[PDB]
Structure formats: structure tokens, C-alpha cells
Amino acid sequence: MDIDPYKEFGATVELLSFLPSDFFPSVRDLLDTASALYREALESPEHASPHHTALRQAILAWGELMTLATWVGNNLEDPASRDLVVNYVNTNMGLKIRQLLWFHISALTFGRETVLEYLVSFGVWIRTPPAYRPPNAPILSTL
Amino acid sequence: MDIDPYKEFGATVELLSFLPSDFFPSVRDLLDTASALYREALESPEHASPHHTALRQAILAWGELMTLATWVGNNLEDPASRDLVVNYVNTNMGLKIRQLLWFHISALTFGRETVLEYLVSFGVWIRTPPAYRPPNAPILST
Amino acid sequence: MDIDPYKEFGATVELLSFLPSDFFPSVRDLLDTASALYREALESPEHASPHHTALRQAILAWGELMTLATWVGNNLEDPASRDLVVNYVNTNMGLKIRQLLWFHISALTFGRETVLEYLVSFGVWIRTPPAYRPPNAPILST
Amino acid sequence: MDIDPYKEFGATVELLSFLPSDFFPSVRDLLDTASALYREALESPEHASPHHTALRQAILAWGELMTLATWVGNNLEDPASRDLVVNYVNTNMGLKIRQLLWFHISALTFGRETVLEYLVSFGVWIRTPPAYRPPNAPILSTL
Amino acid sequence: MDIDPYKEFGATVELLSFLPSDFFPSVRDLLDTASALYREALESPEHASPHHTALRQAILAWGELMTLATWVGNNLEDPASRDLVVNYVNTNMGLKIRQLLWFHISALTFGRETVLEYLVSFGVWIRTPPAYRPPNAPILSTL
Amino acid sequence: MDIDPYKEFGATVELLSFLPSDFFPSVRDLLDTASALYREALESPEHASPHHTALRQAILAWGELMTLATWVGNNLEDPASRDLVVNYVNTNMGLKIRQLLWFHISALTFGRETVLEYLVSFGVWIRTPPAYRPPNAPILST
Numbered sequence: 001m002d003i004d005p006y007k008e009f010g011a012t013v014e015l016l017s018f019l020p021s022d023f024f025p026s027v028r029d030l031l032d033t034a035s036a037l038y039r040e041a042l043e044s045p046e047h048a049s050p051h052h053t054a055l056r057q058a059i060l061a062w063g064e065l066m067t068l069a070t071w072v073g074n075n076l077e078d079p080a081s082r083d084l085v086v087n088y089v090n091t092n093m094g095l096k097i098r099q100l101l102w103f104h105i106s107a108l109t110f111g112r113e114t115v116l117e118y119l120v121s122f123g124v125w126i127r128t129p130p131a132y133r134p135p136n137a138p139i140l141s142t143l
Numbered sequence: 144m145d146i147d148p149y150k151e152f153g154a155t156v157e158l159l160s161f162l163p164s165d166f167f168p169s170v171r172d173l174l175d176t177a178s179a180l181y182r183e184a185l186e187s188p189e190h191a192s193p194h195h196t197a198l199r200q201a202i203l204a205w206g207e208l209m210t211l212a213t214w215v216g217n218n219l220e221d222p223a224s225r226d227l228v229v230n231y232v233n234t235n236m237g238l239k240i241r242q243l244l245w246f247h248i249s250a251l252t253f254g255r256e257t258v259l260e261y262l263v264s265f266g267v268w269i270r271t272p273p274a275y276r277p278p279n280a281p282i283l284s285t
Numbered sequence: 286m287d288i289d290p291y292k293e294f295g296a297t298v299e300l301l302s303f304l305p306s307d308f309f310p311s312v313r314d315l316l317d318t319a320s321a322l323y324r325e326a327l328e329s330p331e332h333a334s335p336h337h338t339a340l341r342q343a344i345l346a347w348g349e350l351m352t353l354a355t356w357v358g359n360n361l362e363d364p365a366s367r368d369l370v371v372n373y374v375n376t377n378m379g380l381k382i383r384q385l386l387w388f389h390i391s392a393l394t395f396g397r398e399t400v401l402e403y404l405v406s407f408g409v410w411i412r413t414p415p416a417y418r419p420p421n422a423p424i425l426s427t
Numbered sequence: 428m429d430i431d432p433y434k435e436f437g438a439t440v441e442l443l444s445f446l447p448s449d450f451f452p453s454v455r456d457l458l459d460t461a462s463a464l465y466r467e468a469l470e471s472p473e474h475a476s477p478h479h480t481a482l483r484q485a486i487l488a489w490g491e492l493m494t495l496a497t498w499v500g501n502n503l504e505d506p507a508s509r510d511l512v513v514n515y516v517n518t519n520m521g522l523k524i525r526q527l528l529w530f531h532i533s534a535l536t537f538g539r540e541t542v543l544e545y546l547v548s549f550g551v552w553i554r555t556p557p558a559y560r561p562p563n564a565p566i567l568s569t570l
Numbered sequence: 571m572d573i574d575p576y577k578e579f580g581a582t583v584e585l586l587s588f589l590p591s592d593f594f595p596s597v598r599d600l601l602d603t604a605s606a607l608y609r610e611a612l613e614s615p616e617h618a619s620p621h622h623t624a625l626r627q628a629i630l631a632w633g634e635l636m637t638l639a640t641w642v643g644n645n646l647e648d649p650a651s652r653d654l655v656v657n658y659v660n661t662n663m664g665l666k667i668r669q670l671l672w673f674h675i676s677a678l679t680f681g682r683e684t685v686l687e688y689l690v691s692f693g694v695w696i697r698t699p700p701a702y703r704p705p706n707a708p709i710l711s712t713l
Numbered sequence: 714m715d716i717d718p719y720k721e722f723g724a725t726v727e728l729l730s731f732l733p734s735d736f737f738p739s740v741r742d743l744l745d746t747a748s749a750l751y752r753e754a755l756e757s758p759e760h761a762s763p764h765h766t767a768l769r770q771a772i773l774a775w776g777e778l779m780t781l782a783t784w785v786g787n788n789l790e791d792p793a794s795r796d797l798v799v800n801y802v803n804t805n806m807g808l809k810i811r812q813l814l815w816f817h818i819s820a821l822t823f824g825r826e827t828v829l830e831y832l833v834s835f836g837v838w839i840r841t842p843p844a845y846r847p848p849n850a851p852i853l854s855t
Contacts, residue, residue, distance in 0.1 A: 001178045001185065005203055008190045015606020018599050035144045047151045050190040057200040057243070060148050064239055071231060081224040088214060093207060117712040120679050123603035124710050127595035127672075132692065134709045168412030172303070176408055179299015188610070245412070252405050269417070279419030284406020285399075286462045290487050293474045320428045327428065332435045332477040342484040345432055349520060356515060366508040373498060381491055385484070449842060456840035463731040464833065566847050571752045573769050578760045605714055615720035620766045626718050627770040634774075634806050642798065648791040655798070658784065663777055670770075 010116055016099055018123045024098035031059065034105055051104040062097050065089060110142050148243065152255055159242055161266035167241040177248055194247045201243050208232055253283055290385065294397055301384055303408035309383040319390055336389045343385050350374055395425055437543055443526055445550045451525035458486065461532055478531040489524050492516060537569050579682050586669055588693040594668040604675055621674040628670045635659060680710055721763060722825055729812055731836045737811045747818050768817045775810050778802060823853055
């Protein structure tokens, strides 16, 4: 069970490790986006796509991790350990959760095919060194 | 954002508030059962039933948390915070992950409706004093 | 070569990893039951169901191992190695042979699907703390 | 329950005790043969013939006996007992398991009828003393 | 024989001397992208295109070379020679492996004709002196 | 990417490693044969068959390894490391490249099915003992 979360969505995780951290914007932005755009889809008792379901589970998990951060904030005495822990959290689990959220929400809004083709073109782009790399990378949209 | 992860299956988090904490099992056994019964359906490219997807994401989350715990165990100095964090994980977040995993596993194998009937029958069983309560609470099979 | 002997029946060795060791019964009683219920179908020339074939080969293997144990008991000098080997057989290899025999016997008599349901229901029963667990775990019959 | 493992395959064990040990080659050769030729049949969750099923069970049993040998190798102090035990193993259980494996795999590759007729002719052959016995015994093939 | 490997696909090594070295990105990025895209089709027991087959052979070649690198790292004593071997490998032979990977992967995604047109357009781009050279080097897209 | 390159042609490294290593000829004679027969087809602009393509890429890999060999021979100072590296190459990677080249060449000349049958028959020949084995090993041909 080395399970790939994207295998049922056509892609893999090695695909997405090509592109950097900074392209993934803040967790709070993605959560607010998801809420504002698809609260009707999330809260309703009908699953339109498995993207929505994994999105629900990821949002719940991230809420639990925020509870973890708060609990460690309100109980531990050593500032070093607390800072190190929250740094690890908001860096690495931030990376992974932002990745997952971006993929699911992008595939919903713009379509699975378009996202896969975008990631193909981006993997071709960023894998080019600066000399022959264009300065303004591809951007995402439907048509 | 105020989501109940069970809203899409007819169930509700309040419905599991019937069940106590101690009832749900250790995590290692759950993961072992899940793998040994559904390895091929998990790793394969198919969302044959969305319970599979929830199980995928839950297992990945628990792996992420185990990586967190190991990272903390092999980097920090004060063992107080270390053991405290490990305890907090394995108790409190273990509760949520156990809830979610148990539910989705039971729904995969035995069926959603039968699981709902199991939960409500257990709530009837436990909303009852000890004496007239039979000592063999319901456990499920087909 | 990495074979699971249960792969051909929808089951999996990981699925039996739910069950503990002590649960499965002594070997002599299993062999007695097997013979007394299926002597004619075993010795007869017919592979009416492949569980019969697995049972044949398993009984022959256990007879081979009992012959091994007797051969060691009536040829060696140091009783340490003697009793050690006998213990190792009757515990560790007994585990595998008991697993295999119990499964194939239950599948012969009661049915493959019902046995799978039995295993998963037992896993639900045991992935549960002691208190809310009923003290009458499922046992099977028709 | 003096069960014959071959009664459901047309033959018996007294049939095969006519022919010698040496005709059965090494266990490792047979296992590697079985793997190389029919890993797709073994590992798949579909039983094509009861030969395959008994083959699975025999391979698992032999793996367990190898585990037995290793365990005795790693725990006992008396070299005499260890050597005697492993000798018994690789001689006698070697004989039986090689017999079983050869029969099943041969019947699969070449057919049950051909194997039974081969064993008939061989029992007629080796049961002849050297004077009137041919020097180059029968060999196995389809056509 | 000095086979021109790109000869089946209308392309040349002369066509690749248009491109500089730095244009090709790091090998780990290539492998990660290739995995996350087409891991299933690679491990799939089917030859979808000769591109796939050459890609499989090249991945195995790189695996052999990295295994060699690890062996030499874990057994050799003369350190300057060791480091020089490692750098020589991962630069000089990594270059050609990157050429191979990039070509076949881009041909899989976007098509052979498109890659050829890309290469000749890039040649027109770089063979222009830097003054009147436009600032945007072309890249690829399904847009 | 647990890749086995022979999957495109109905075989595996395990099916191929069923033979010993000594059977596999030296790489030099293989390149001699392959060149002196199919140089015109392999340098051609034509994907005549995937066997040719795997052969092309494999020959590139081996030529590049020989380039490495010459670089090492003409640029290191410590001859011990030179010997270790070079003989390690021609043993370990020599084995794999020999296997690959022989497979694809045999498939070109005689045909895929025939080479598979030859592997099977030769292995069953060589592992079976000589007395009851056929007197001569089979040798593949149309």
C-alpha cells in the first residue's frame, strides 16, 4: 500500500513533484475558494464526483491539523519545539494539502483533461533550463 | 466549510456520537485488514465506489501523521513535548481516523444500509441500563 | 513463487491476519472431523470441488511432518533438540496447517461466501474494545 | 484416510515408486521451472486445473519446510542433530515433493494421458533386468 | 555500426546540436514527469508505440548506470577517481540520456511533427544573434 | 516503474534467467552477427518492428558503456580501481546486455514464439538429469 491518491484520476504524484512549492498558494486561499465556489456541492448529501469526496476528506483532515496546531500552541512550554512543529506543519503538510486541493478543485472547475494537459506542458516547460526556457510560463484557463 | 464527512452517505457525525471511543479498534489492525482485503482495488485506477476514495485519502493522511510523529521523534530535544505530541496524535487524531476508516471499511464490505442499521441497533443497545442489556452486543457479518 | 494459497478463492492471507493463533483448534480434532465427514469423497477418484484437493495435499503434508517428528524422536540423542523441534513443528507449522485445513473444511461444508462473511464479521467483532464487544462471538452453522 | 494424492488424477503412488530417485531432479530446478512457466497461472485468482491447486499447496508446504530448515540452522547447538535432520529433509521429503511436482507439472505441460502412458512404459522398462533392458530408457515429449 | 537513433523519427543528432546543454533539465525532473504521466503505459505489457519501447530501454539503461554509481560509491577507495567518474557519468552521459528522454516523451505527448517544427523554430530562434533575437524562446502547448 | 522490458514480447527476466549465464555468448560475437546481418535495416529510417528499436537503443547503451570504459582506461591513475570498475561492468551489465541482445536477435531471425519455446525446452533439457534426458539438446530453427 504505497497508494497513489491520483491513480483513479489519471495522474500520479511523481507527475506533480516536477513543479515547485510557490505555484501552490496559501491553504486558506484554497479553502476559501472551495467554500465560495462549491459549498452547495460539499454540504449537500449528494456526491457529484469523487473529486468532491476526496476534497471533503482533505478539508476535514486539514481542520484537524489546525486543531493539532492550536492544541500544541495552548499546552506546551518549550517555544523551540512548538515553533519547529508548526514550521514543519505549515511547510510540508501545507505543500501536500495545497497540491491535493489545487488538483481536485482545478479539475472540477476547468476539467480533468485540461488539467492533465496543463501539467504535461508545465513539466515540459520547467524541465527546460533558463537559457531556452520562456520567461512567462503557461497559465491556466478553459478556452 | 462546516462539512460532515458522512453527509453524503445518509449518516451523520452525531450518529457516531452514540458510539464510545474505546469501541473502535486499534489502527494497525484496521490498516492490515484494509490492505489484506482491498490492496488491488485501492492501488488500481478505479473509483468503483467512493468509499474506496475516502479510504485512500484517509490512509494517506495517517501516513502523513506517522511521518510527522517520526519527524518529531528524531529531531526534538525535550522528550516531554515528544511523548505529549505522540499521545495527542494517537489518541485524539486517532479517534477521527479510526472513525472514518472503520465506517468506510464496513461500508465497502458489508453495505451502507446494514452499517446504518448496525449503528442504530447499537444505539438502542447502549441507551439501556446494564442489567436488562444483553452482554452480547451486536457484531456484524453475512 | 510469491503465492498466496487463498488467492484462488477470493480470500487472502492478510485477511486471516485478523484472526489470532489461539482461535484455530487443535489438529487431531480437525483431522477426525475431516475424515468422519468426508472419507468417501477424499479417497474417491473425484475432484468434485478443489477444496477437496487442497485438503488431500494438506493431510498428506501433515502426515509427512508427523513422520518427520517420529523419525527424529526415535533416532536422535540430545532430547533438547528433540523436544525443541517437536515444539517448533506443533506450534509454528501447526499454525499454517491449521489455517489451511480449517479454511478448506469450512468452505467444503458451509460455503465459500459464508466463510468470507464469517471472517469479515469476526474482524469487525475483534476490531472493537472488550466492553462493548458482545461475549458471544459469531460461530457458524446452517 | 490412507489417502492417495493421485487417485483424482488417474494414478496412484505405488505406480511411481517403481522408478528411482535420480530421475527426479533438484527441488530448486522444479520450483524455478514452475515459476518461469506458469507464474501467470499460479498467481492469478483463477484455478485452471486441480493440478495447479495442488501445485500451489505443495510449493507453500516446501517453503515452510525451508523455513523449518533455516530455523533449526539458526537455533540448535548440536551439529550432529542438525546435519541428520537436514539430511533427512533434503533426501526423503525432497523425494516426495519432487515426485509430486514432476507429476503435476508434466501433466500440465504435456497432458495427463501422455504422462500415464509414459509411466506405464517406464514401469515396463525398468522392471526388466539389465540383460534384456535397453540401454537408453524412454524420454518424455508430446509428439 | 554508427546507428542514427532518431533516423526512424525523421530526426538527427545534427538536429540536436542546435540545442545547447543547459536547455535540458535535470534527470530527476525527467524521470518524475515520465512516471507521473505514463507509468501505467510503461509497465503495461503492450507496445503502444516505438517511443514507449525506446523509453523503457533508456530508463533501464539509466537504472543500470545509477546502480553502477551506487556500487562504486559503496566499494571504491580512490576518492578523486570516484568523484571524477561520478561527475563524468552524470554530466556527459546524462546529457545523451536527457536528449533521448526529452525527445521521445515530447513526441508521445504532442506528436513527432510538432516536435520537429519546435526544433527547427528553436534553431531559427538561437541562430539569430542576441541583439535582434526576440526575448521569448518558443515552448510547447496543447493550447 | 518496476519495469521488465520483456513484457512487450510476452516474456520476463525470470523466464530468461531460467537459463544459466554461460549459455549466453560473448557480447562481441553478438554485435558481430547483429551488425553483419541487419546493419542496413537498423541504420534505416524505418520502424520495421519493435525488436529493431530495442536493439538500436541497447546498442547505443553498450557503445556508451564502452565509451565510459575507454575514458576510464585513459584518464584514471590508480589501476586497481580501473580493474574493479571495468570487470564489474563486463560482468554485471555485460550479463544484462547479453541477455537483451540475444533475445532480440533470436526474435528477429527465427521468431518470438520459437525463441520462447526454445527457452522452455532448453531449460527443461538442462535441468533434467542426463540419463533420462534426450541425448542432444534442442537447437532452435524454422
